[PDB]
């Protein structure tokens, strides 16, 4: 399928696998995406990271 690259996720780190019948990419199905996740971005955004076994404040 050689179409237009106008999907909202064009140029996204997560790899999508979809189906489509029109020249416009956004008309495609939602499909399946990559299952990567980065919890630390929200749960552990400290400058100097501390280990599980250490005393957090030293």
């Amino acid at each position: 399928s050689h179409e237009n690259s106008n999907s909202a996720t064009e140029g996204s780190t997560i790899n999508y696998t979809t189906i489509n019948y029109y020249k416009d990419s956004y008309a495609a199905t939602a499909g399946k995406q990559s299952l990567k996740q980065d919890p630390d971005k929200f749960a552990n955004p400290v400058k100097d990271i501390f280990t599980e076994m250490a005393a957090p404040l030293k």
Partner: protein
């Protein structure tokens, strides 16, 4: 050229946003490793310092003796597309006969999905969202009856002439996209791209849309951001005479190819208006169920 030392050794200008963390693949839940009794001095996983601002890093293995568990529970159903790509009601348009609202055979719907709690509360979990969408239009009489009526739906982007009547010249629709369909036919359905002028729509805009003194009169525009206003959706019975039947069009939206940024606390007070987070002050309720005492279930 640059010759003075401070300029050579300057950092002014690097566009590379250095990131402290990166994403790893995680198709399934984490496994549990065997662990034994640890009676050490120095090592202390249980103790944390929440002031830092990070969540506890203590794990099952270090808090109790655990067995090995190969966890193959999938994490696929919690991806943004899995969560959002389910069509929900976002708008209703009424086309009554002898009524007050639209007794003229047509109707203009301002494209805003914030009129329904379910859908709204979900999207408001994030601040910025970028996505394509599939819209489905279900039409029938007020009793859920189906009649042989031909309808015309038209997307009127900002700047295009809004129809002022069932016979308005604007329905010539020479450039706007229109859809003609019968109530007997199945629900009309189309795909819509990400149309904002911004890189993402945003459910919250802490600001004003224009410069100048922001006196009382204009306080209605606080939080209003044009980048979120995609236009008008107009519908009309296709004729020069009044339709014989009253109609209702329910609009359903199904987001797809979704990306979101900046999570927010989830709404915990009833919604009152489309344009703002106003809540009923004399009725602030706790987020959940309450009990008589802290020592009793």
């Amino acid at each position: 050229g640059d010759r003075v030392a401070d300029v050579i050794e300057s950092s002014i200008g690097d566009s590379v946003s250095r990131a402290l963390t990166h994403a790893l693949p995680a198709p399934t839940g984490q496994n549990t490793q065997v662990s034994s009794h640890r009676l050490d001095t120095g090592k202390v996983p249980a103790l944390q310092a929440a002031e830092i601002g990070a969540s506890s890093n203590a794990s099952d293995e270090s808090m109790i003796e655990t067995r090995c568990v190969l966890n193959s529970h999938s994490t696929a159903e919690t991806t943004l597309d899995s969560f959002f790509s389910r069509a929900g009601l976002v708008g209703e348009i009424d086309l009554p006969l002898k009524g007050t609202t639209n007794p003229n055979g047509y109707a203009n719907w301002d494209i805003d999905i914030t009129g329904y709690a379910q859908m709204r509360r979900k999207v408001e979990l994030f601040t910025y969202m970028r996505f394509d969408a599939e819209f489905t239009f279900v039409a029938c009489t007020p009793t859920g009856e189906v009649v042989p009526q031909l309808l015309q739906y038209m997307f009127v982007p900002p700047g295009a002439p809004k129809p002022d009547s069932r016979e308005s010249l604007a329905w010539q629709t020479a450039t706007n996209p229109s859809v003609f369909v019968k109530l007997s036919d199945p629900p009309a359905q189309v795909s819509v791209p990400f149309m904002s002028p911004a890189s993402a729509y945003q459910w919250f805009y802490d600001g004003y849309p224009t410069f100048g003194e922001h006196k009382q009169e204009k306080d209605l525009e606080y939080g209003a951001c044009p980048n979120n206003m995609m236009g008008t959706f107009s519908v009309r019975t296709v004729g020069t005479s009044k339709s014989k039947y009253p109609l209702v069009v329910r609009i359903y939206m199904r987001m797809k190819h979704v990306r979101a940024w900046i999570p927010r606390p989830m709404r915990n007070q009833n919604y009152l208006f489309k344009a703002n987070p106003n809540y009923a002050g004399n009725s602030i309720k706790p987020t959940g169920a309450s009990r008589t005492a802290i020592t009793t279930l």
